């Protein structure tokens, strides 16, 4: 299955794995792996970016590595070539001193609007994504 190939790789590369209960899976990606791993996910078959959700952790009780984190939802849509129907989540923490992330508009067209709504709400600049 396309899912296990992402988790088996997640352990192999050292990414944290959250198991919200369950069938929904989180893959925490450092900013250094983000741009390449996302394109790798598209190459693996995750041809649909369902949702991008930002997060401000300043009010939640327990702390996070950084204040900001941006959540990505990847789907391998039903249909062909061999759309498995797979779905998982990609989280990457963003430091509030350097609130920048690589864009994925060159990977999924739905990112242009999704990355814009996160920018307007949280001020997290996505480089390459055109603004002005």
UniProtKB/Swiss-Prot annotation:
UniProt entry tagged with the keyword Transport: yes
Domain of life of the organism encoding this protein: Bacteria
Record localization: Cell membrane
GO molecular-function term, one example from the UniProt record: quinone binding
Signal sequence coordinates: none
Catalyzed reactions per annotation: a quinone + NADH + 5 H(+)(in) = a quinol + NAD(+) + 4 H(+)(out)
EC number: 7.1.1.-
A GO cellular component entry from the record: plasma membrane
Protein name: NADH-quinone oxidoreductase subunit 5
Organism: Thermus thermophilus (strain ATCC 27634 / DSM 579 / HB8)
Gene: nqo5
């Amino acid at each position: 299955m396309r899912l296990e190939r992402v988790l088996e790789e997640a352990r192999a590369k050292g990414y944290p794995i959250e198991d919200n209960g369950l069938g929904n899976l989180w893959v925490v990606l450092p900013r250094e792996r983000f741009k390449e791993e996302m394109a790798h996910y598209k190459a693996m078959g995750f041809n649909f970016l369902a949702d991008i959700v930002g997060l401000d952790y300043l009010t939640y009780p327990d702390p996070r590595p950084e204040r900001f984190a941006v959540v990505y939802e990847l789907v391998s849509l039903p249909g062909w070539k061999d759309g498995d129907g797979s779905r998982f989540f990609v989280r990457v923490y963003v430091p509030e001193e350097d609130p920048r992330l690589p864009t994925v508009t060159d990977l999924w067209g739905s990112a242009n609007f999704l990355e814009r709504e996160v920018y307007d709400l949280f001020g997290i600049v996505f480089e390459g994504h055109p603004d002005l």
